[PDB]
Amino acid sequence: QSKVRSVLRPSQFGGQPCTAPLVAFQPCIPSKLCKIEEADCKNKFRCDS
């Protein structure tokens, strides 16, 4: 899960950079299941990619 914050003003003209992550992630245990499944194409050759 993602935790995110906003730039209130950018740095410029050599001021200190923001110097910290704008987004953090934390491992969850998910509540729902993945409804994404492979949509394997009907007829085109499926590359191993």
């Binding site: 906003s6 730039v7 950018p10 740095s11 410029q12 003209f13 409804k35 994404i36 499944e37 949509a39």
Partner: protein
């Protein structure tokens, strides 16, 4: 570009949403203005000034000798937040050309100083995003299913009958109640029943005529329909507005199986 991928459309629309949030978060309009007509650009955490030709140094601060043109300025400010939904439920937002304001005949800020959008809300309790592809729905009439379960396919109902509960497949031992069209009555056992071999125990039943509809002939007036539906031998009056006749009787009746009616035209009499 996002095309021909699993959930292509859902990802596309998510990506549009994200792009709008991303622009709103990281648009360079929020920079302090560059000197000497530097166009600001923002790489997430820092504004960097693109210097005009004839301006140089790290961020354009020293001009060249020929630059002249001092304080000839002007560039867009940021968008306002959206207005609330107006009388026509349209929200709107504006940007003020004020960053920097136009000066000394420098350019007015480019493009539309306002945006307007019709309001919208998600109404239903969506449990989550569906994986929607580009074209998976496009089949209106698929291949006939294999029917591996070997039940009963839908029987053709008898004349003037219909299925209360039309389905592709009926279960073994399932019985289907036929019923008779608007003018008709069921006589006999109105249930077929699906046998284990896929036959239908086809009922000793047939729809008998109760009534006859108002006759389907092309008209505008020249008619007096006492009813939408008529018993056999009930009058239907085809009265001309001016006593002429176009075809057939100026009044008839459903004699039985039919009126034996004129098939070529209505009584659109001459007048």
């Amino acid at each position: 570009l996002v095309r021909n991928i699993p959930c292509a459309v859902t990802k596309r629309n998510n990506l549009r949403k994200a792009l709008q949030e991303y622009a709103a978060k990281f648009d360079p309009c929020q920079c302090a203005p560059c000197p000497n007509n530097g166009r600001p650009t923002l790489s997430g955490t820092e504004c960097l000034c693109v210097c005009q030709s004839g301006t140089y140094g790290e961020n354009c601060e020293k001009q060249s000798p020929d630059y002249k043109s001092n304080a000839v300025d002007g560039q867009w400010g940021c968008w306002s937040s959206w207005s609330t939904c107006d009388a026509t439920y349209k929200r709107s937002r504006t940007r003020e050309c004020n960053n920097p304001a136009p000066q000394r005949g420098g350019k007015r800020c480019e493009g539309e100083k306002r945006q307007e959008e019709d309001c919208t809300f998600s109404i239903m309790e969506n449990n989550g995003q569906p994986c929607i592809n580009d074209d998976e729905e496009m089949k209106e009439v698929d291949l006939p299913e294999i029917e591996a379960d070997s039940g009963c396919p839908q029987p053709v109902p008898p004349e003037n009958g219909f299925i209360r509960n039309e389905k592709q497949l009926y279960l073994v031992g399932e019985d289907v109640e036929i019923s008779c069209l608007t003018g008709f009555e069921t006589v006999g056992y109105q249930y077929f029943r699906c046998l284990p071999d896929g036959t239908w125990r086809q009922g000793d039943v047939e729809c008998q005529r109760t009534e006859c509809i108002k006759p389907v002939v092309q008209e505008v007036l020249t008619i007096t329909p006492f009813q939408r539906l008529y018993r056999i031998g009930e009058s239907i009056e085809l009265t001309c507005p001016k006593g002429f006749v176009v075809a057939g009787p100026s009044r008839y009746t459903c004699q039985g199986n039919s009126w034996t009616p004129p098939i070529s035209n209505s009584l659109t009499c001459e007048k």
